[PDB]
């Protein structure tokens, strides 16, 4: 019964592929040829935030677009002030291998997760100012790769457990488990409406989950290697992925396939972090060749380069007004660009 | 007024930067070690003896030097990704069960994972301390001769023991052959790529061997020394 059910699976997959080709009546390379290019984007390093002791693996902006959190392999979760380049809190973590960190959109909490298979929640808006553990969200059987704070005491955590999860912090138990990925789930990105989120895994596939229902609303294939970063389009009807394939792909939730491929023949390095500009026309991408590329989201052209990192660029982040770009890297330096 | 609040930010940042210096003095003093291995490779006993005799996390201290060993446990078997976390790691401790059978070529599986570690472009400067574990069960296995490596490695029969052999008392030539033959199967990968950046330090250990904490400490000193000697291009 297995071979016949595999045959059923392959013919239904072929049906989905033919329905995608039937939806493929044109491309962006043909419709956007009449779309003017963005020119040469020559962005320069505005501020240099130094102080981390190891590779900076994660970074996330506060809702004020002023404060960042940066997580580094040394065991630190530092809160920065980008306007006053000042450290507000230096949160030591129980597990040095912190692979992710999040700043709550309410500003109240900050998360961090890694190889301990635990997402640790620290309370920023505490009565004494001492950022202390609120919860330790255990339950994943794999390393915690990316956690994004949902608004109402919920947190969307992605693990190497091949399973995402939506945790209720007040209780400490996950209310939903998002399953279907066969590889290590590497990165998350909450949609602007924070009702759907997207997951990248080492199966080169991305899954659009309904956090309210718990189903994979959509599975996007097309990348060729491990999805290292994912980020939503500003309108929440598309998302961009970066992988070790050394290419960025732009999937559309409606077109149900790739829109553009952001690759260059002289680029052989994996893409570790992805972000967007306010218009979504500029695609911020961190690379292994130690520099970030600002791709033309409508032409797959390298509109610019954010170079100046002495090692692999691990985390990107755009200010809530889009006024700056923070780039943490394995060189332990978080640089602000504009 | 905003000057006063900005000066309060400066004072809190000053305290925090003092604390971060005080914490970096501890960070760059402890050595990070990634401990890899196959299924029931005997590495758990090595953890226990390195723990008590002075994922899971182990902080020990030998000769006043701090080491942190990170036994990746409760993790999947797809070591592709979290191993990128281990570049600042001074040494990737590779444990091979030399007598894993008496299941299915665990030695060739370790050879291929070892090759994939060296050719990994992020581990192209992280050295690998290689623990060929279970050298005692391989002793009785090959001297018994009922379960051979020749059926798994025909060039073992065509392999002659090197002149650098130092057999322990009781190590018959039939065992010091397989002992040094496997070691050169790994050195065939350790020398055919990435010279001068990273180095393999193969060792022969067992559950009863206790100075494994000094063999790793001596070769992590060797790793740091070679990293400095290549910072000045003296090596």
């Amino acid at each position, epitope marked *: 019964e297995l071979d016949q059910l595999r045959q059923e699976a392959e013919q239904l997959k072929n049906q989905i592929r033919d329905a995608r080709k039937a939806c493929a009546d044109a491309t962006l390379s043909q419709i956007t040829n009449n779309i003017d290019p963005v020119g040469r984007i020559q962005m320069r390093t505005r501020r240099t935030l130094r102080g981390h002791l190891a590779k900076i693996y994660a970074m996330h902006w506060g809702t004020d677009s002023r404060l960042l959190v940066s997580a580094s392999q040394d065991g630190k979760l530092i809160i920065w002030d980008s306007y006053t380049t000042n450290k507000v809190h230096a949160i030591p973590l129980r597990s040095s291998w912190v692979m992710t960190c999040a700043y709550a959109p309410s500003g109240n909490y900050v998360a961090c997760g890694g190889l301990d298979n635990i997402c640790s929640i620290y309370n920023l808006k505490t009565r004494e100012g001492n950022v202390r553990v609120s919860r330790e969200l255990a339950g994943h059987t794999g390393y915690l790769s990316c956690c994004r704070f949902l608004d109402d005491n919920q947190i969307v955590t992605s693990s190497g457990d091949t399973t995402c999860a939506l945790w209720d912090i007040e209780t400490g138990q996950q209310t939903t488990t998002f399953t279907g990925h066969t590889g290590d789930v590497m990165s998350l990105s909450l949609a602007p409406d924070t009702r759907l989120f997207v997951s990248g895994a080492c199966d080169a596939s991305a899954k659009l989950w309904d956090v309210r229902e718990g189903m994979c609303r959509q599975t996007f294939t097309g990348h*060729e290697s491990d999805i290292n970063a994912i980020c939503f389009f500003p309108n929440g009807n598309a998302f961009a992925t970066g992988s070790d394939d050394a290419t960025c792909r732009l999937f559309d939730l409606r077109a149900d396939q790739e829109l553009m491929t952001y690759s260059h023949d002289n680029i*052989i390095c994996g893409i570790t972090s992805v972000s967007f500009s306010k218009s979504g026309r500029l695609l911020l991408a961190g690379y292994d060749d130690f520099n970030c590329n600002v791709w033309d989201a409508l032409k797959a052209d390298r509109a610019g380069v954010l170079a100046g990192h002495d090692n692999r660029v691990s985390c990107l982040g755009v200010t809530d007004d889009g006024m700056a770009v923070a780039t943490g890297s394995w060189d332990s330096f978080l640089k602000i660009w504009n | 007024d905003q000057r006063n609040e900005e000066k309060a930010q400066r004072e809190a940042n000053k305290k925090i930067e003092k604390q971060l210096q005080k914490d970096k003095q501890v960070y760059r003093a402890t050595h990070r070690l990634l401990l890899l291995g196959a299924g029931e490779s005997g590495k758990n006993t090595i953890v226990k003896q390195m723990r008590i005799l002075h994922i899971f996390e182990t902080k020990f201290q030998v000769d006043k030097v701090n080491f942190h060993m990170f036994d990746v446990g409760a993790q999947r078997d797809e070591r592709r990704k979290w191993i990128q976390c281990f570049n600042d790691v001074t040494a990737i401790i590779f444990v091979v069960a030399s007598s894993s059978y008496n299941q299915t070529n665990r030695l060739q599986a370790a050879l291929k994972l070892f090759d994939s570690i060296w050719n990994n472009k992020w581990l192209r400067d992280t050295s690998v301390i290689l623990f060929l574990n279970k050298q005692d069960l391989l002793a009785e296995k090959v001297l018994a001769g009922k379960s051979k490596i020749e059926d798994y490695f*025909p*060039e073992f029969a065509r392999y002659t023991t090197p002149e650098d052999a130092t057999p322990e008392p009781g190590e018959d030539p039939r065992v010091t052959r397989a002992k040094y033959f496997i070691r050169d199967e790994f050195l065939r990968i350790s020398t055919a790529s990435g010279d001068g950046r990273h180095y393999c330090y193969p060792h022969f250990t067992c559950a009863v061997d206790t100075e494994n904490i000094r063999r790793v400490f001596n070769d992590c000193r060797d790793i740091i020394q070679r990293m400095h000697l290549r910072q000045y291009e003296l090596l």
Partner: nanobody
Amino acid sequence: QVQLQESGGGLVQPGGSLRLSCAASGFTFSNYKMNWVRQAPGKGLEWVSDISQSGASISYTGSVKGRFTISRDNAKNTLYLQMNSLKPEDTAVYYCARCPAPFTRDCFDVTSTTYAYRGQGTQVTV
């Protein structure tokens, strides 16, 4: 879609010869290192033989050296394994696998229990 379909297996008498064809589709074959792994009955996934993108560096498992031979057609996206002078231990489901990253000599986790870019396997009974 990383697609790895395989053909050419089946039943053969001990001592025969077989050639397994790995028709890859969905990823540019010349970009990434390819190899064969096999899962004999007895719960063991073992790597068999490497071949680089260009086909210059070829290794073999000891138990299959001199008797197994691999080729690659980067144009047709196919990998072959001619299995000459078979032994009763050679009964196994052979998976045609490629390591995750292109332009890398490193080959991680092709032999993992639930690897993603590993073929569907063909059973070769001796």
